[PDB]
Amino acid sequence: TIENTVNSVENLFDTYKLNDTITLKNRILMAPLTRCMADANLVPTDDMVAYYARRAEAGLIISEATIIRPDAQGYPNTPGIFTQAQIAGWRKVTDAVHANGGKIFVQLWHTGRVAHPHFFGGGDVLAPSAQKIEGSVPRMRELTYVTPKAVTVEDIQGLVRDYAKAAENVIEAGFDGVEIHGANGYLIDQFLHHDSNRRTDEYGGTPVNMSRFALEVVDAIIARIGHDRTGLRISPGAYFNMASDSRDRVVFDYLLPELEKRDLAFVHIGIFDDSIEFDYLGGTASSYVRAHYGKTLVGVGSYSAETASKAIAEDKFDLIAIGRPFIANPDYVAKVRNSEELVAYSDEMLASLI
Numbered sequence: 001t002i003e004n005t006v007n008s009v010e011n012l013f014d015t016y017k018l019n020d021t022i023t024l025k026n027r028i029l030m031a032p033l034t035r036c037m038a039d040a041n042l043v044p045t046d047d048m049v050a051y052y053a054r055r056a057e058a059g060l061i062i063s064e065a066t067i068i069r070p071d072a073q074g075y076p077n078t079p080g081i082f083t084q085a086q087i088a089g090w091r092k093v094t095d096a097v098h099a100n101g102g103k104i105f106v107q108l109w110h111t112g113r114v115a116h117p118h119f120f121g122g123g124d125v126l127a128p129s130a131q132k133i134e135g136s137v138p139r140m141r142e143l144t145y146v147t148p149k150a151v152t153v154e155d156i157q158g159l160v161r162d163y164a165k166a167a168e169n170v171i172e173a174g175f176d177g178v179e180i181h182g183a184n185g186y187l188i189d190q191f192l193h194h195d196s197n198r199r200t201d202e203y204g205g206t207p208v209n210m211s212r213f214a215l216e217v218v219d220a221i222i223a224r225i226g227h228d229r230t231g232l233r234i235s236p237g238a239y240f241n242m243a244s245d246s247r248d249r250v251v252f253d254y255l256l257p258e259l260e261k262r263d264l265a266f267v268h269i270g271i272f273d274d275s276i277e278f279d280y281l282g283g284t285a286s287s288y289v290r291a292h293y294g295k296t297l298v299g300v301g302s303y304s305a306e307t308a309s310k311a312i313a314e315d316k317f318d319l320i321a322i323g324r325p326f327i328a329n330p331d332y333v334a335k336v337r338n339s340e341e342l343v344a345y346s347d348e349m350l351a352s353l354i
């Protein structure tokens with residue numbers, strides 16, 4: 001069991017060959033972490049360059065969620081990858097990571113119903129269905145979420161196009177690849193769950209239909225940059241801006257074998273504590289995916305180096321993403337390697353970019 005941790009995490013430092021294109025120097029990923037520190041043009045800053053560069057001992061960094069176009073924005077100062085200036089800013093980031101001997105994927109984002117018009121000139125918020133989430137944008141003054149417009153099939157075609165274009169830009173920006181943000185209640189995840197997807201056309205109703213948008217985005221991006229440079233984060237368990245539905249599991253039962261056919265660089269779980277068991281999944285999120293998907297899997301969520309090592313030793317998943325400890329400890333990898341004390345994460349640390 002994972003709690004029976006041992007006195008060595010050597011396996012975390014195994015070389016891991018993702019595919020013919022990419023080999024990782026270790027199994028430790030920096031999880032994607034929104035920091036809200038990009039400039040007014042949503043361009044990565046030189047402070048962001050330094051922040052990523054100092055974490056290049058990670059086998060692979062997954063960037064903070066990066067928006068594909070303006071109506072994807074739901075939080076302040078989140079970087080994009082749709083303008084030339086943004087591409088240039090990211091190129092500074094990737095160049096610095098590579099110069100430090102690291103690798104980095106961008107996480108491509110559209111927030112769907114979690115966008116807010118304050119950020120993009122009062123335009124329409126888009127989602128599979130006109131189902132508003134509760135509340136307001138965190139850490140902002142009174143920005144109440146709004147009822148989305150249910151996307152038309154023409155909207156959907158444009159969105160697929162824009163995911164694909166962003167992927168092309170990612171290559172110009174010198175990233176090693178893309179992690180498609182299909183998790184945590186955002187646009188792609190919205191198509192995959194019944195709470196948000198009440199459609200009755202070819203994008204709703206059945207597992208095949210509800211999976212259609214995800215697969216169209218994945219296929220369009222592969223067509224642009226190749227399967228070896230394409231990963232996907234998913235959240236089979238509803239927990240963030242998403243109500244649960246007992247019918248969601250069969251959507252993922254369909255999706256996962258379909259994803260296997262695309263021979264992705266990895267599938268990555270989106271969750272905060274993977275020790276949590278989901279009734280509807282019959283156990284933990286990672287164990288559910290591991291039972292329905294037989295290629296590289298990134299685990300995440302409240303793992304220590306020790307419990308991650310044990311999980312990987314027990315074949316529960318292949319790579320470990322580390323989030324909050326990488327905020328608290330820029331030198332996470334070195335400290336783990338040398339058995340040094342790690343600082344515990346505190347939410348207060350988000351005020352600083354170090």
Ligand SMILES: Cc1cc2nc3c(=O)[nH]c(=O)nc-3n(C[C@H](O)[C@H](O)[C@H](O)COP(=O)(O)O)c2cc1C
Nearest residue numbers: 031032033034064065271272300301302322323324
């Ligand atoms: C401040 C913060 C920002 C996050 N931003 C993202 C993000 O941009 N994209 C994403 O998929 N997950 C995001 N997450 C979730 C993390 O990637 C990760 O799944 C979560 O922090 C659990 O892992 P951990 O226990 O090692 O921190 C974020 C989490 C935190 C705490």
Ligand SMILES: CCCCCCCCCCCCCCCCCC
Nearest residue numbers: 237238239240272276277278347350
């Ligand atoms: C500033 C960092 C993020 C702050 C908000 C946390 C978002 C994730 C919340 C974790 C899970 C809560 C609800 C889960 C419901 C279903 C669980 C079985």
Ligand SMILES: O=[N+]([O-])c1cc([N+](=O)[O-])c(O)c([N+](=O)[O-])c1
Nearest residue numbers: 034065075109138181183184240
């Ligand atoms: O504030 N945020 O923009 C934000 C974004 C993401 N995300 O996944 O893209 C999160 O998972 C969280 N989160 O749950 O902490 C926050």
